[PDB]
Amino acid sequence: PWELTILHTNDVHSRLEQTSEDSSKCVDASRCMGGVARLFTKVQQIRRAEPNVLLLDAGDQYQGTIWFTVYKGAEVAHFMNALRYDAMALGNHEFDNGVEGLIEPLLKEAKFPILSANISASGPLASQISGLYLPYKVLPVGDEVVGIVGYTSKETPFLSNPGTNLVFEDEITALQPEVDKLKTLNVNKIIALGHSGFEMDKLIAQKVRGVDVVVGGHSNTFLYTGNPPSKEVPAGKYPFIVTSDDGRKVPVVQAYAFGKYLGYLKIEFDERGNVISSHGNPILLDSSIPEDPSIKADINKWRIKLDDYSTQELGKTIVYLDGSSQSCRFRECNMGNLICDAMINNNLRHADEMFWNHVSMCILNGGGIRSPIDERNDGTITWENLAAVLPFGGTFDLVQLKGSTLKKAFEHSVHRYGQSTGEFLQVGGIHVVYDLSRKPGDRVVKLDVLCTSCRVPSYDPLKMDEVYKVILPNFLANGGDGFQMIKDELLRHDSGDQDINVVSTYISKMKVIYPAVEGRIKFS
Amino acid sequence: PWELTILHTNDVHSRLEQTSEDSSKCVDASRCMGGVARLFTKVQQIRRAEPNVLLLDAGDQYQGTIWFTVYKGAEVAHFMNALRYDAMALGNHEFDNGVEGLIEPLLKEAKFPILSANISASGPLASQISGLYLPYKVLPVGDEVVGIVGYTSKETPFLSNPGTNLVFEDEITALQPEVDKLKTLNVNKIIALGHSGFEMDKLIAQKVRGVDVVVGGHSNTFLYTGNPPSKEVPAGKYPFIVTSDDGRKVPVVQAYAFGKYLGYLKIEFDERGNVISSHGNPILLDSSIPEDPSIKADINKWRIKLDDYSTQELGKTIVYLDGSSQSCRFRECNMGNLICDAMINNNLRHADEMFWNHVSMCILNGGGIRSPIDERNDGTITWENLAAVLPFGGTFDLVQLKGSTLKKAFEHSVHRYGQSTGEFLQVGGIHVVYDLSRKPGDRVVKLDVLCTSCRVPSYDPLKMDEVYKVILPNFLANGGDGFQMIKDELLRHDSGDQDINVVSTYISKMKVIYPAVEGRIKFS
Numbered sequence A, B: 001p002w003e004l005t006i007l008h009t010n011d012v013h014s015r016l017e018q019t020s021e022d023s024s025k026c027v028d029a030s031r032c033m034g035g036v037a038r039l040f041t042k043v044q045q046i047r048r049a050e051p052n053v054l055l056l057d058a059g060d061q062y063q064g065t066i067w068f069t070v071y072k073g074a075e076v077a078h079f080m081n082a083l084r085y086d087a088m089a090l091g092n093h094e095f096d097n098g099v100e101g102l103i104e105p106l107l108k109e110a111k112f113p114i115l116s117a118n119i120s121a122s123g124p125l126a127s128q129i130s131g132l133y134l135p136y137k138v139l140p141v142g143d144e145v146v147g148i149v150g151y152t153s154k155e156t157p158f159l160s161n162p163g164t165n166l167v168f169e170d171e172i173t174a175l176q177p178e179v180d181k182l183k184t185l186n187v188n189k190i191i192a193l194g195h196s197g198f199e200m201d202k203l204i205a206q207k208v209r210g211v212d213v214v215v216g217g218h219s220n221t222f223l224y225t226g227n228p229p230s231k232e233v234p235a236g237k238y239p240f241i242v243t244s245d246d247g248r249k250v251p252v253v254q255a256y257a258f259g260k261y262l263g264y265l266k267i268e269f270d271e272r273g274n275v276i277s278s279h280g281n282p283i284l285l286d287s288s289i290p291e292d293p294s295i296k297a298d299i300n301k302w303r304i305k306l307d308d309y310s311t312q313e314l315g316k317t318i319v320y321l322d323g324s325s326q327s328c329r330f331r332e333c334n335m336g337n338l339i340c341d342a343m344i345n346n347n348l349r350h351a352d353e354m355f356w357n358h359v360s361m362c363i364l365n366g367g368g369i370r371s372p373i374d375e376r377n378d379g380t381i382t383w384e385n386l387a388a389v390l391p392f393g394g395t396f397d398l399v400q401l402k403g404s405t406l407k408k409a410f411e412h413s414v415h416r417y418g419q420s421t422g423e424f425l426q427v428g429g430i431h432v433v434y435d436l437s438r439k440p441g442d443r444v445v446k447l448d449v450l451c452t453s454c455r456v457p458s459y460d461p462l463k464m465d466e467v468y469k470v471i472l473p474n475f476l477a478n479g480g481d482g483f484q485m486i487k488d489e490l491l492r493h494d495s496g497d498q499d500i501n502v503v504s505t506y507i508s509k510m511k512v513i514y515p516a517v518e519g520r521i522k523f524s
Ligand SMILES: Nc1ccn([C@H]2C[C@H](O)[C@@H](COP(=O)(O)O)O2)c(=O)n1
Pocket: A365, A366, A367, A368, A369, A392, A394, A421, A422, A423, A473, A475, A480, A481
């Protein structure tokens, strides 16, 4: 029996440095986790001990911290090269800076094959990108070979910025011919590595004949066999076993997100590339594992430009930006307005005759706003100032909510109004009126929202059964601040850019900002 | 007796081409007027016939049409050089593009002296600008000499962009020492040429001993002796005679604006530079005077880059920009909102602890809006598209209005509502509610306006006695659309940038716009 050890990461999302336990800035070293230096240590230990090792990444290295802001994927090529990744599948966020922002920093600099079988190019882009990513790669491992076939979420054109000369085909339709092609090269050991989410990964396991193992991403899925080592709650066993339509047992794995774990799966194969068995579990990269000193020092050197950048002027405010709790927890505050205006301004997508913009509405819990910004420093705003206001390392995500759900959110906003609790909502694209003299749960007396299906944006009454796209913090999408109805009733949830990045981009675009308190929220 | 003929222009405001009768785009050639080609013809005729001629400009060549937008004052140097101006005084608008935007295009390229006695520099600017403008110049004319001393409105730092290293001193205080200095050079014939307005010009005539003639600007003053040749109504005789405190008769002249007239004054001087008499009148530059073919052809060559520029993308809209009369004459329309947002965004001036911005409020008569803009041309907006919306060649000006006046304007807005008349107001920085069921004159039921003296902008009720700064079309400032109360009751009026330029600058800044109908105007 020939044994393969698959080490794998997915949705690292620019967590090049070690993080806190919930994947934000590392504050208390003794409780910090992940980062590429620690991952280096663990990979190097395993590669010392085990004969046949592949280190794979299932996409979404791009986007998530100031690393990506400053280095735009050059940090991904550099550190992935240093860790000697064996292959990577493209994810949705690898198109965030467009095709050009993928070809250069990543495709041209990676020292390992980057894979996707279901993306095809045309127009002049076809010539520019030809051969710079591949449907599959056959890799020598020990004395054997392993084929790896890649795939990328077919939703990518709605989520990111691939442009109009890339077509994203159905994953299963695209993969089958490639796997058939591998069979014809006498490749009998096949990994599907790709970035479409656990539910798609299971379908690939079931339906794509010849696939031996699926290594996936995109859904931040945590799989574990046994007691969970940290706070993530498993979505299922590791590996998750799919019974394929050809009656094989196909293991499916993922390793959460943010570089906190190193996926580790051992597969025993017989002479004909059939899986005898497979077992393993993600490894929690906690502080018991030392950060490799060399990679740490290189990280520290790369961090000099980030620190520099963090204190430069992004743009100016001519107004005090009132992020005080005494305002933002009690009434409309102009810092809430700025953040929402920035959320809506980020990622505009228009379709003639269809929508002026795909999203028009924003909500933001006042407790998420953690500082004002003073305008009397020559009006300068820096990334560091924005980090005081938004210090949690979160994202601004897009969800789809029924009107009824959002009406419940706005009742929750004021259900125990007056105690300075964090749940009071700042808004954009929404005009709400409350009457606090009404019973809790019945205080929203007017709730109008900006149309999307219109050529001229205007405000209409919220409709209980209609589904609205809303940008809001990942904190709220996950039901924080007691917004359980959002978590439980949302119909879709896509993760977006890092919170600070969204606001900094808007400020840099606008050059000079002056958000006002203008009657988005009123009390009768 | 030695006779001097002073030809003079002021406040030409970028009217390099011939104009209509009210100084807008020339449509019907047979009724077009001014422009530098026609002015060339007239100046050349007078210089053939009269021995001792100076051609002077009293400032504000900068700003007013796409000429200045594209060529940024290089068109001023070029054409003023071609006409062989003898001297020019700096006006307020010559600082519109900052000190750098004056030094280069104009100061370094003019082939005539540029004058101002009351502007002084310090810091590193003092070294950069030293000698590039002068307090005075002594010019040979025939066998004699004439001293010309310049001055510039002391209000310039509030009106334009001179920066903090220029100090603008009181005009009379500054001029006296210079005129004293000219006396000590045996210069007995002295013209004060400068840019502070007719009322200041009269005070200079009265108070600055040794000044023989004042040639002024800034107030667009039309002076005429006899029947007016066109539609401008004279503010007084030409020349206007001031009796100086030394008991001389000092003629004061101006020649309206926009290059429509050539000021022409003849002064007879005795042996000791005393004015025996003076007489003349501005010459209407109507179509009876041919445009000089050579200057016309040069104008036509310069116009190629303007036409090119006029069809380039300034930026994009993702919304239909509803400038239809059926909207903008009846209710809030998003094109009205865009224009007002652009008016407020233009010329931000902040003072810590004093005001977030000097102005927060805009009104715009719906009849001034003359086209929508369709977003389905790839969202592109061009200068040509903006010229369909704003075709009158007007400016967006700043006035100071009491609350009572503005409440009267808003009653006028709806006094005969429902007939699609042009006076209905689009707004910015104002939340108005009307109740059309009330009697005319009593229909405004709520009128809230954005504070200026505040660090966080918010809306407060309008106060009848308080004075508000409002940006609005020069059309309205002059009482158009029956807004007689604005003309009659305003406390101050400063003329700003060309209407199209203001909107194009904003669109270029924003890159992608999406103005909404959002409840700035409501009906109860
Ligand atoms: N990642 C996080 C963590 C906390 N919060 C918010 C929830 C509460 O509104 C506030 C913390 O409550 P308090 O400031 O009252 O301790 O922070 C947030 O928005 N995002």
